[PDB]
């Protein structure tokens with residue numbers, strides 16, 4: 001019993017974190033095999049902020065301008081290259097702690113664990129969702145650049161996020177591990193802002209299923225709805241459209257609880273229209289949308305790695 | 306910016322988890338140096354549930370009745386002893402991954418990270434508080450017995466909780482790592498239930514300070530209160546009494562925000578009396594009490610390990 005915001009165990013990622021310094025800028029990097037991945041922002045100075053030409057900044061650098069520290073050990077940089085908004089520093093030492101890994105670009109609505117780091121040292125671990133607006137609601141201070149987000153599947157770390165920047169509303173923007181931003185963001189100083197966000201409807205339904213599995217039914221009702229009629233209410237409350245693919249993905253939770261997806265949609269419609277009348281669901285007075293259907297199955301079935 | 310339920314990085318603990326089997330019972334153990342710690346329940350059969358005499362059950366065991374597996378490696382048990390409600394199995398191999406560590410018995414209101422495990426394999430990591438009633442609101446399935454709770458301080462893992470059992474309301478009970486239960490619970494089948502719980506008042510004030518640090522002031526007011534008058538309202542809403550020690554512990558957050566502790570108490574009193582009028586604080590529509598003052602400072606100052 002119980003239902004928590006549960007991160008993956010972080011040990012496989014902790015062993016990959018390093019500190020990268022160029023000039024007076026220090027941030028985190030990810031050491032896999034003999035490569036260190038980090039935000040290309042590390043080559044900027046406090047002037048190369050408004051319109052940096054990174055190709056021009058990087059051609060002016062030598063391997064020796066990059067200091068990489070793993071614990072209290074200095075790794076010698078023997079090659080450097082830029083891929084989109086990441087820098088790849090080839091080092092003279094393969095990481096003996098390199099886990100089985102992949103790089104994956106996730107869809108909005110997917111969740112991942114963040115290992116927040118400072119100066120190449122892990123600080124803490126928490127669960128995030130990629131928002132529909134391609135931001136994350138993280139927790140990052142100055143120095144957290146190059147902190148990574150990941151999922152674990154049996155033996156294999158899927159890296160999906162590298163942190164770059166904080167936007168004016170205090171939400172966060174970053175890249176895949178090939179250096180492509182999520183969303184329209186750029187690594188320069190502009191008036192860029194988070195777009196309007198929406199609630200992840202399939203995740204809210206997953207979490208209502210979690211609540212039933214965990215022995216709570218107060219919010220259920222005897223009604224059903226059509227997908228089309230549900231989506232007309234979704235739109236009114238700034239919820240993502242529910243697709244047939246989302247209905248299919250909820251099939252396993254539907255089967256385990258004996259509650260049809262469109263019946264759970266009718267519960268959600270009543271919750272949006274009426275609110276909770278001072279009641280809670282899994283300890284929350286709001287409708288939670290940062291658990292995927294896979295996250296619910298994992299935490300109700302006890303899969304390990 | 307941002308504020309998350311943040312766990313400690315789990316790698317130092319992952320390297321200590323093992324599987325222990327006695328008869329048909331399998332659960333998790335903690336391998337530190339050449340000792341494996343696990344719940345003494347592992348020696349019970351489905352009959353030794355109502356009134357087990359553990360001393361009598363254990364004298365009937367041989368070292369060879371205990372199977373300890375670290376990854377796919379079997380550790381030979383060379384000695385066994387019982388300390389309160391834990392079993393200590395001496396093994397022929399020291400854990401080469403043993404971190405710097407301590408065993409600590411925490412106070413109610415303190416928080417810790419749980420590494421939920423099954424079959425000696427870590428599943429996930431989340432933050433918990435020890436409730437005033439000496440339960441935790443965890444997330445544990447069958448097989449999670451012997452999962453541990455911990456805090457990390459620089460280089461040093463402080464183990465504070467070993468999981469034993471689920472109580473009828475779906476909350477959890479366990480021991481310190483010397484095998485003493487938190488609360489009045491026993492490792493036998495009885496009508497034991499969680500006592501009435503209360504809200505951790507000092508933690509709610511810490512989290513209101515977090516909300517100010519993170520740029521939110523809507524709930525503040527121009528009033529102050531006396532400690533005595535605040536506690537008369539605390540009592541009405543089933544909040545823990547606020548002590549002068551709690552006031553002293555909030556001093557650093559008070560100093561950083563320029564909001565006197567008793568002024569923040571006046572904000573909390575108004576929130577209890579009026580509710581939030583459909584507003585949120587740090588993404589929550591309820592008053593959060595599972596962040597200590599130390600947890601707020603850590604996540605607003607960026608301490609690492």
Ligand SMILES: *C(=O)c1cccc2[nH]ccc12
Pocket residue numbers: 027039041042145146163164165187188
């Ligand atoms: C940190 O990597 C980073 C990336 C883009 C912009 C920025 N400003 C400060 C720090 C950064």
Ligand SMILES: *C(=O)c1cccc2[nH]ccc12
Pocket residue numbers: 332344346347450451468469470492493
């Ligand atoms: C698991 O360790 C444990 C301890 C006490 C009681 C109990 N019942 C089932 C599992 C347990």
Ligand code: NA
Pocket residue numbers: 220221222223224262263264265266267
């Ligand atoms: Na329904």
Ligand code: NA
Pocket residue numbers: 525526527528529567568569570571572
């Ligand atoms: Na006040």
